[PDB]
Amino acid sequence: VSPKTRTSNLKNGLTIASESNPLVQTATVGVWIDAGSRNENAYNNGTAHFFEHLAFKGTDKRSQHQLELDIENMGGHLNAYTSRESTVYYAKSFKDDVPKSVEILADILQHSKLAESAIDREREVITRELEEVNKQYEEVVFDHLHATAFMNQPLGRTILGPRENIQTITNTELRKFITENYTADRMVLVGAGAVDHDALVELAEKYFSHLPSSQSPVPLGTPIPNFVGSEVRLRDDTMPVAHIAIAVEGVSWTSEDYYTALVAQAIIGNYDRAVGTSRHQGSRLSNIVSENNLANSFQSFSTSYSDTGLWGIYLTSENTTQIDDLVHFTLKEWNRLSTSVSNLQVERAKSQLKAGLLLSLDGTTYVAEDIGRQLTTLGRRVTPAEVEAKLEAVTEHDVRAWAQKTLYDKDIALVGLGPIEGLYDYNRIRNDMSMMRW
Amino acid sequence: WGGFSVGNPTLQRFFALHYLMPFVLAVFALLHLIALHTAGSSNPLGITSNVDKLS
Numbered sequence: 001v002s003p004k005t006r007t008s009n010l011k012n013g014l015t016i017a018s019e020s021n022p023l024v025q026t027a028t029v030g031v032w033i034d035a036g037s038r039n040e041n042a043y044n045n046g047t048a049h050f051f052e053h054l055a056f057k058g059t060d061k062r063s064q065h066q067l068e069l070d071i072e073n074m075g076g077h078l079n080a081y082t083s084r085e086s087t088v089y090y091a092k093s094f095k096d097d098v099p100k101s102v103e104i105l106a107d108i109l110q111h112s113k114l115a116e117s118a119i120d121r122e123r124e125v126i127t128r129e130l131e132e133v134n135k136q137y138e139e140v141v142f143d144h145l146h147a148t149a150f151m152n153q154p155l156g157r158t159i160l161g162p163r164e165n166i167q168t169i170t171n172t173e174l175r176k177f178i179t180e181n182y183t184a185d186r187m188v189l190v191g192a193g194a195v196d197h198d199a200l201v202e203l204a205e206k207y208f209s210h211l212p213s214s215q216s217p218v219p220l221g222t223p224i225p226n227f228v229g230s231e232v233r234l235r236d237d238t239m240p241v242a243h244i245a246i247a248v249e250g251v252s253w254t255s256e257d258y259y260t261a262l263v264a265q266a267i268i269g270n271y272d273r274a275v276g277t278s279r280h281q282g283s284r285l286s287n288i289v290s291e292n293n294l295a296n297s298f299q300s301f302s303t304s305y306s307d308t309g310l311w312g313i314y315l316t317s318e319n320t321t322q323i324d325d326l327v328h329f330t331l332k333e334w335n336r337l338s339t340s341v342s343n344l345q346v347e348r349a350k351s352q353l354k355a356g357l358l359l360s361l362d363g364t365t366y367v368a369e370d371i372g373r374q375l376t377t378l379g380r381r382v383t384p385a386e387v388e389a390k391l392e393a394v395t396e397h398d399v400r401a402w403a404q405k406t407l408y409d410k411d412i413a414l415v416g417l418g419p420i421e422g423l424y425d426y427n428r429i430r431n432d433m434s435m436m437r438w
Numbered sequence: 439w440g441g442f443s444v445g446n447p448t449l450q451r452f453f454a455l456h457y458l459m460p461f462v463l464a465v466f467a468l469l470h471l472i473a474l475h476t477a478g479s480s481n482p483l484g485i486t487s488n489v490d491k492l493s
Contacts, residue, residue, distance in 0.1 A: 428493060 005381040006197040013185035018197040027193040028364040030090025032372030035181035046161020095194035106207035114171040149413035184211035193364030221377040225308035229411020239418035247312025253377040266349035285333040294326040323422035331432035337403035409434040
């Protein structure tokens with residue numbers, strides 16, 4: 001039984017949430033923001049990502065060089081990432097270096113220079129990032145998957161944004177973005193590891209007290225996405241490995257089917273030929289794939305957003321003449337979530353998840369990420385007891401009912417990259433989303 | 439004819455051969471498709487379709 005997550009508020013509406021661990025000597029503190037690329041329009045798409053670069057380019061007090069020195073002197077590091085709905089800025093340090101790190105974070109968020117000289121310098125760095133993500137095949141596949149599934153909608157935009165916007169982002173629009181979105185009621189200061197809650201709340205009162213509140217304070221994790229069945233093919237015969245993602249519209253964070261979708265995802269599970277245990281996994285798809293050498297790997301996912309999600313699978317394969325078999329058998333395993341799953345598969349997957357959801361949290365950064373994600377998507381940290389109860393309530397009837405409305409005979413979003421000549425047209429893939437025998 | 443003009447022998451042999459010939463024709467129809475299957479169907483542009491196939 002893990003220590004309780006303590007939670008306090010400030011007057012502006014900033015949440016402070018902490019989980020102490022007197023067994024470790026380091027602490028991760030940071031700011032989880034309920035804002036990301038989704039909050040941009042088509043004209044300033046890329047702003048959120050751009051700001052993340054400029055946040056470390058110098059403040060009203062410390063210059064870029066001074067900033068570097070300050071963090072180096074603390075001894076730990078700083079890290080940041082921007083997604084579609086969430087921005088994070090955190091600092092891993094020693095126990096007694098926590099007040100320094102909170103001070104640095106408050107400074108880069110509230111009092112960043114955004115000087116025209118630095119904007120112009122980063123404009124080239126970010127331009128180069130456009131031509132180097134091309135190598136990260138999984139990211140390419142998932143960015144195209146969002147682009148097609150949420151065609152011409154805010155969730156369909158990339159985080160980097162288009163080349164055109166990168167050349168036209170001004171300090172004005174940067175300042176406007178962070179003034180509108182980085183408000184206290186959308187921010188959570190999170191501490192995990194060697195932190196005292198009462199100390200963290202004092203530091204928050206010292207550094208984050210002059211944060212603007214938004215005009216209309218909605219609860220944390222408050223959002224209409226219209227999924228498009230569609231495909232993107234990025235054929236490249238020179239690549240040896242095909243990368244394929246297939247997804248349907250999934251579930252949001254607060255869906256009533258949230259846990260049912262996770263259990264269904266665990267029944268299919270993951271596979272990797274490089275891991276020794278993977279040939280012995282219980283998953284039917286895993287057995288088909290390993291026995292027939294159909295793939296190098298597959299990973300089931302159930303990605304959630306505030307008002308929608310994507311549920312599906314990501315496959316990698318060198319077997320270019322049996323891509324048809326791989327996709328065929330994958331979708332036939334999905335069909336069985338509607339037609340055949342019983343207490344056998346469901347209880348097994350629940351057993352695996354009950355542990356998995358706790359296992360994931362194995363260091364201070366993981367714990368801080370968990371607190372921050374849950375507070376910014378649900379508005380609370382869900383205790384392991386509540387999670388154990390919600391998982392226990394998932395029955396085989398629930399999985400079958402969920403699959404029959406979410407998977408069975410539904411439109412998919414499909415992305416293929418690489419030697420995908422063997423991937424059949426949309427209709428033949430989508431026809432595998434039902435069984436004529438049932 | 440089986441005789442000196444068209445008559446009964448001719449008619450009975452034409453029946454037997456009329457029954458047979460369609461089976462022969464079905465075999466040759468199958469043969470011409472097996473022969474085609476090496477290059478595949480041509481198409482109205484006259485170019486290769488190896489670039490863009492449909493089931």
